[PDB]
From a paper:
Recently, mutational screening analysis identified the chloroplast-localized HJ resolvase MOC1 that is essential for chloroplast nucleoid segregation in Chlamydomonas reinhardtii and Arabidopsis thaliana. MOC1 exhibits dimerization and an RNaseH fold, belonging to the retroviral integrase superfamily. Moreover, we characterize a base recognition loop (BR loop) that protrudes into the junction and disrupts the C–G base pairs at the crossover. Residue D183 from the BR loop recognizes the cytosine, determining the cytosine-dependent HJ resolution.
We first determined the crystal structure of HJ-free ZmMOC1 (T107-V280) via iodide-based single-wavelength anomalous diffraction (I-SAD) at a refined resolution of 2.5 Å and the structure of a quadruple mutant NtMOC1 (N108-S275, I112V/Q162K/E235Q/239Q) at a 2.0 Å resolution. Structural alignment of NtMOC1 with ZmMOC1 revealed a similar fold with an RMSD value of 0.919 Å.
Author numbering:
A (entry chain C), B (entry chain C): 3 to 72, 74 to 169
The structure:
């Protein structure tokens, strides 16, 4: 009855949809790291795992995670993408959750965002239409990570946008 | 009293040194994946975790893992490197182990392999000198992953090569 959505990137989030209709979303924890004298962010492994071990989702809950691709930042931009992705899939399988990777094109096309002039903005609107109680948590432009994780869970659950304006 | 060494790559291995002097080494489990019509290998997350949960190393054992760098295969060659690395560090932290990353230059320089004409061959020799009971398991050229994992654990433990020939 539960479902999890994971935007695995820095700036991402993990969302939990419960069978009683309620939802939750948590920002991905991160630390700082200096790579070649440049300040980078890096996911916080311990905080992610402890977050997963504190969820109310029963073991076996399916986690829908975006398997993405950054090709204009190149080396150590794909290392970061694979690192964050490998970190999340391992943390989920170790917490008792089943993992289903979803292409970014797939969940965006389902919610009609594939060719959006404002993709991050529309995802927050689409996420607040599905979960109006998260409207506070989708206010800022930096909340598109929370929105993607919610849409990833909503796609995996098969939710549909109600008829109305966008 | 225990120590773990992890060559995180495909073709890598995980080694366990016990306080009674004995040692073990396991090949990294993998699956096949077709990426852009090309057959690739990819670490087996479930088999890695189950392997970690079956070790006799008590919780809190430090795991020394190589943090490496492949720059002549480029895109999706660094995604693979970060993916395997993120997969391992998450699987280790989730199994109760503490992680200490070690540069490839660091452990190679400690065992005098930094400027070796035959780096993979010498690592197997160095590993069989430290652990002669693994001589059978270091016979083939493809066993350099097992050797690296053993040397990673031997470095983290502070072992020294006895005086003698190489």
């Amino acid at each position: 009855g539960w479902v999890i959505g994971v935007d695995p990137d820095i700036g991402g989030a993990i969302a939990v949809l419960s069978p009683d209709g309620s939802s939750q979303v948590f920002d991905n924890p991160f630390v700082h790291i200096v790579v070649s004298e440049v300040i980078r962010k890096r996911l916080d492994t311990k905080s992610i795992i402890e977050l997963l071990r504190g969820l109310d989702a029963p073991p076996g809950t399916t986690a829908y995670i975006e398997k993405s691709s950054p090709p204009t930042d190149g080396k150590q931009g794909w290392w970061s993408t694979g690192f964050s992705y490998g970190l999340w899939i391992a943390s989920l399988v170790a917490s008792g959750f089943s993992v289903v990777p979803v292409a970014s094109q797939t969940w965006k096309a389902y919610f009609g965002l594939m060719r959006s002039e404002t993709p991050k903005d529309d995802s927050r609107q689409a996420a607040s239409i599905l979960f109006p109680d998260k409207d506070q948590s989708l206010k800022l432009k930096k909340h598109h990570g929370r929105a993607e994780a919610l849409l990833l869970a909503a796609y995996g659950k098969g939710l549909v946008l109600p008829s109305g304006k966008f």
